[model samples]
Target: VPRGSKTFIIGISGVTNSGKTTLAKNLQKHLPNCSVISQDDFFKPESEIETDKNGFLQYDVLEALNMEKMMSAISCWMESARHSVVSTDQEEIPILIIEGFLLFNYKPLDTIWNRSYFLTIPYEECKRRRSTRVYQPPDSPGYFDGHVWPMYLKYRQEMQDITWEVVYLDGTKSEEDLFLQVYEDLIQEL
Candidate 1:
């Protein structure tokens, strides 16, 4: 890749309450020719999202996402990046950092990544962090235990049987620590 201009698609996917978004932005600001793609943006219309037995929105699951639409955006970014390579120096590589919960579980995207990271935290801490956030629908009673956490477990487990690979990170780490760690690796990566 160093031989010519290239586009590096780095994935930072992990469980709820993980610092994927924060880490992605931190990296984006520090790197030139970089951008981010969030899986949250590809959620289906509100009415299209499914509900479980608790009547809670199943936003944590893969079925709730428009994977095709997300991939289309990725494909478009990649194409434009490649097209712009002629305008930039050989060392000026474009970067697309994609972050989500189930990103690595998708088969089609498995082959595209230059590097991927998965963050994990203990269930108690994850729940604690998630409780502090304000989401669209907000978590209903028992939503975490009944839906979100359950879906995350299923997806994370499915990841083990996949063909892709990811560098595991501790989500409990401080933002600054995580940023520095990832940044150093990305430096060497380029």
Candidate 2:
């Protein structure tokens, strides 16, 4: 476990294509009226991120996210008990679930999410998923420059001050199994 505190900021974090979003989607199906938020949408517009020699932007780095905007968005939701909050930019909802690959490492984001889950998939599986991800263009700029992943692993190993709960998904565990584990554990603490 990353930290042993019970709070509503359930953060589901993992490397790119590590099933973080998939698991969150599945869990939301079982939990009604749960608002789901993705940090990716708050990313700095592509016009802001730096590009490589081949003109490929590195979307995996910390600089890619719009930290200030995200922090404001999360703070609004965390401070309110309502089912949703209306933002100047967009509408927000309560019972929120914030899903992102770098939620734990990003300082502003970390401060907002009280609970964090990191998917522990083997390196091989992550690579396999990336290689066969035909639904999305393989060589596209969205490939993440293969750096954000190692970033997550490094943070998981070295970061000790952050509050979080660790969950492992080896690509074999069903969504039901994960949801049951999170639900039971969270309920006990609640």
Candidate 3:
């Protein structure tokens, strides 16, 4: 794929508070002809979200997303790229970064990604970061311990068992270092 001709879809996935969005935003700064789509935006309306036995919303699962809509949007973007012309002003390929927690959960979506990444942070660190941020639905007193962390572990283990070929990143690394590693890897593809 020559520069500026193909749409390079990059996937960034990880457990909650693992820095997927932050890394995606930082990467966009370096890749000029890029657009970002967050999985958070595709979440089903609150009324449609599923809840557990104790009445806590299960936002951690793949069912939380409007998968059909997400697939349609990605398909349209890729189809358009096939017929579009390269811009003289843009120096690199038009890139799309999709950041989410359960990006690999859907097999169809997995096939669409040109490169994928999974960020990993220790359970303790993830809890620490998540505690500092105010989330919608307001984190219940035991939400992290009771639901979030357990779901993450479940999915992470399942994804590994499936042998998805994704680059693993250390969430503990300095932001600059992490960015440099991803930037270098992306540059090689270009």
Candidate 4:
């Protein structure tokens, strides 16, 4: 579907512990009429999630998400917004922020974003941050070593190899700085 009037769709993608969600949330606070759709929320139920040969939940892959459902929701939202009229008192346009680790992995999702961003942090730093969080099935002792890190490397390399036209952000930056940089860039685009 064509983008709705005054609607901007932004994709915030990064590896686990790369601060994508944090950035997205901070950006949301600063942007008027902005809403966030997290990829983590679109994941299939735990029972439906696939596992590798070693019985580790493959949460890092694109397959873990309910793509059809996610697309449907986005499409519906866009369609509804297309027909919506801005109120006389409303001065800001609506922005949709889609944040996820595997957002750029799938072509269909990648193509819909008006502007896309990829955040990168070193492996050691990602590991350090990830180790501090609790997760579902796959967040066990060796899951990061076995699946998460490897999948990130694979997808990141593919993105670089394909030369996807996404803005890259330094995940090492402080949350405030990252938000300001992204905000400035988006303002320029608007």
The lDDT leader among the candidates is 1
Model 4 C-alpha lDDT per residue in residues 1-190, reported as the tens digit of each score: 2333667889999878888889999998987767788888888888887889987888778788898888888877777766565455423457789898988878787567788888989888999999898776537888888888998988987787553578998999999999999999998876
Q: Native-vs-model 2 lDDT?
A: 0.63
lDDT of 1 by residue, 144-171 (tens): 8998888888987888787766789999
Positional deviation of 55 in candidate 4, in angstroms? 2.4
Per-residue CA lDDT of model 2 for 81-116, tens digit only, reads 352333344122345678887777776554655555
User: Which runs in model 4 stand beyond 4 Å of their true positions?
Assistant: 1-6, 87-92
- TM-scores of the candidates in the order shown: 0.91, 0.71, 0.88, 0.88
Q: Rate the local accuracy (lDDT) of all candidates.
A: 0.87, 0.63, 0.83, 0.82
**1 or 4: which has the higher lDDT?**
1
Candidate 3 or 1, higher TM-score = 1
Model 3's alpha-carbon lDDT is 0.83
Q: Write the per-residue lDDT of candidate 3 for residues 37-134, one digit (tens) a residue.
A: 88888888889888899877888888888988987877766666655554554243568899999988778765678888889999899999999999
Shift of residue 16 alpha carbon in model 4, Å: 0.5
After best superposition, candidate 1 residue 50: deviation in angstroms? 1.8
